[PDB]
Amino acid sequence: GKVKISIDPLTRVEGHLKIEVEVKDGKVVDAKCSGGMFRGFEQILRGRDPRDSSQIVQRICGVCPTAHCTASVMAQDDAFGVKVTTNGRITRNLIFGANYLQSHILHFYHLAALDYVKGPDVSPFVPRYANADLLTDRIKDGAKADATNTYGLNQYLKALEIRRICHEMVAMFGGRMPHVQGMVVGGATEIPTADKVAEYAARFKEVQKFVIEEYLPLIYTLGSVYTDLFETGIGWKNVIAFGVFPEDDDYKTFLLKPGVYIDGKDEEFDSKLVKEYVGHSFFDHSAPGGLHYSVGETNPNPDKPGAYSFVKAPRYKDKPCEVGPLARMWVQNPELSPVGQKLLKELYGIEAKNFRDLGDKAFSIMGRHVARAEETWLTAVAVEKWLKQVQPGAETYVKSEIPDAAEGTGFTEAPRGALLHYLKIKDKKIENYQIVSATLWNANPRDDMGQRGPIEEALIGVPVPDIKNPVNVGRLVRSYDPXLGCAVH
């Protein structure tokens, strides 16, 4: 009595995604995640001036280009042997941090929320699933249903302007957005002025107000209606984080620290243990067993028997691990926002001080949205601080020369999860460039040993009581905020 459901395109994610599930007795019993578009940035990059990479790589994704730019310039800093100044480090954090706010807001509202909020009766808000299990369906008190839906929809609409303001903030020291000009090997290209810091701060305060007063309350309210969605979309419960937003010049300390949590245990992150498998991916590897990214190979093969995705399969110590706000917030275990502490008590009867106090609820559809909203607040607190630390007039750029032969790796966290760029230089040109990038860790296919990727695994057990309206499949997938451009590059 199994039924197959195939969803292609899985919309309201970035890029080209197919999801296939098998449903039996009202639950998903198997799943496959497929990325269907390939460009091959790692091939395109070969033979170029290594400095070009921080422009080229941004075109992997127009939603998170600052993350790729950050990883690239850090790889170049490493390979070129140059140390960034204090003000360069802070300026890079302000450019990138403004897009963290943009990205999370864009995701929750403009990608995720139409699985919960009933939009106006015009395209692109319709057509939609006939039985969509929305706020207007769930809340049985009709006036409360209308009021809550309108509350959510008005925030969706306002968030269009808030996310645009976040890009004004990115452009302030980044030049423009999408695709900044302001980050390069050696630091940042424009020294912040007192006036421009103040202009960034004024916009930031408006974004921060929306985060605290509108976004956080909506997420906690939404979860209080969809309590069942804290109880499904579980998955491996393995997470990894690389560290993001260095808080000192030697990159020893971060806003959100590196770490790994596997099978209920915390461990340190060791980059030597990252490798990629391609048994079910459209790629050929010269040797069996998975490849560390420092010897990564990008030889596309859409005819590979048994393969079903252009996404490779990264594993850590041969374990599937997921990434993103859930991962970072679990690893760091920061104190929850005052709003979160209050609304968890008021709306759920939950006493919680730190992120891990959510327990099992963290590893779920709603847990992922909560992690993302809380991280948006946490990032805003950091930006508010960096705005006081940044020094008008202080040098942000240090000169460098392209080395003949070198290697470098840039480690960061994209808004969607752990990101590194590995750069190998020979004869002053890119010899190899290997990208291991956020959604790659989430939306990957099975490895050579048949272990499902995190989204695939998290789909197992998701309720599908109505096969014609399988709304929880998309809800699970979108809780991960996938970027398939990033996943495949």
């Binding site: 195939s6 395109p9 899985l10 919309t11 309201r12 994610v13 970035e14 890029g15 080209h16 269907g36 578009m37 390939f38 460009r39 091939q43 395109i44 070969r46 033979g47 001036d49 400095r51 070009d52 422009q55 080229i56 075109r59 992997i60 994704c61 127009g62 939603v63 280009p65 864009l106 403009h110 939009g119 106006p120 015009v122 395209s123 692109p124 808000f125 057509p127 939609r128 699933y129 269009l160 302007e161 996310r163 645009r164 990115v170 452009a171 302030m172 020291f173 030049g175 423009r176 957005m177 999408p178 695709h179 000009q181 390069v184 290209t189 424009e190 859409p302 942000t396 000169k399 451009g485």
Partner: protein
């Protein structure tokens, strides 16, 4: 107040053209969506998914045959029978599954459109996906149309990404033309099919640093005063109105901040590289 019907499709794109559109002002995106266009299909933001989303796309392409704009973001890969870009899966009168390639989708929808508008350098000219080293046979809309012998009105709005003013302005001008062609002639296009409205000015000729250039005052590094030519600026060979319009609601632009990388040009990126070596 009849809105322009739009079907927005993505090939080998990064969604940056879409994100740049979301940054529009005067009008802002809310007014664009509710008052200016009917965005019928767009994979990043639309409510429906899978079978329902594709069925709706095709229903619009039929009901509004010869009366919708096909907006294309990203390049069209032609190697390996189009299999480097699968845009969806369709289902027959029987129950079987068929993948749809970007090639198949464009071949299908372009003849149904009123006009095709290639937004971004990828769709207009090939861009980064079509750059040296790619193995996907990545192609622009104009080249794909030529290979396919498709004659459909085509307007290119390049940039990586294009400014929202360029996309909105071009689309509004096209729609105005359709509604009253003699009162609103189509914008004059250059040899590369992009409107002179936005791509007629040379960046360098219009640059506020031109006086410094003329006096041989060149910035020694990014954070020193002077013209940016020695840092790699491609303003001299690039045609766009960025010096006037600036970016992100007038907040900054590439040349003030750093360098122009020639992102609107048909030879971007290879003809504009290395980015940090002077022209």
């Amino acid at each position: 107040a009849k809105k322009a019907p739009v079907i927005w499709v993505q090939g080998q794109g990064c969604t940056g053209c879409s994100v740049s559109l979301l940054n529009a002002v005067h009008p802002r995106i809310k007014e664009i969506l509710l008052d200016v266009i009917s965005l019928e299909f767009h994979p990043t933001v639309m409510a429906s998914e899978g079978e329902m989303a594709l069925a709706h796309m095709y229903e619009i392409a039929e009901k509004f045959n010869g009366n919708f704009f096909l907006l294309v973001e990203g390049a069209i890969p032609t190697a390996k029978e189009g299999r480097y870009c699968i845009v969806g899966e369709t289902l027959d009168a029987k129950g079987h599954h068929h993948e749809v390639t970007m090639m198949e989708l464009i071949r299908d929808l372009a003849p149904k459109s009123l006009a095709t508008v290639a937004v971004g350098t990828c769709s207009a000219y090939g861009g980064i996906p079509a750059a040296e080293g790619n193995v996907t046979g990545s192609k622009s809309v104009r080249d794909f149309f030529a290979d396919e012998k498709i004659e459909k009105l085509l307007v290119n709005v390049p940039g990586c990404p294009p400014h929202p003013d360029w996309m909105v302005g071009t689309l509004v001008a096209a729609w105005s033309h359709v509604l009253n062609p003699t009162e609103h002639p189509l914008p004059e296009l250059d040899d590369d099919g992009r409107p002179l409205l936005f791509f007629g000015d040379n960046i360098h000729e219009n640059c506020p640093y031109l006086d410094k250039y003329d006096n041989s005052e060149f910035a020694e590094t990014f954070t020193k005063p002077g013209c940016k030519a020695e840092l790699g600026c491609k303003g001299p060979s690039t045609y766009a109105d960025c010096a006037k319009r600036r970016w992100n609601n007038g907040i900054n632009w590439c040349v003030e901040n750093a360098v122009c990388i020639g992102c609107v040009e048909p030879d971007f990126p290879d003809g504009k590289s290395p980015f940090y070596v002077a022209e």
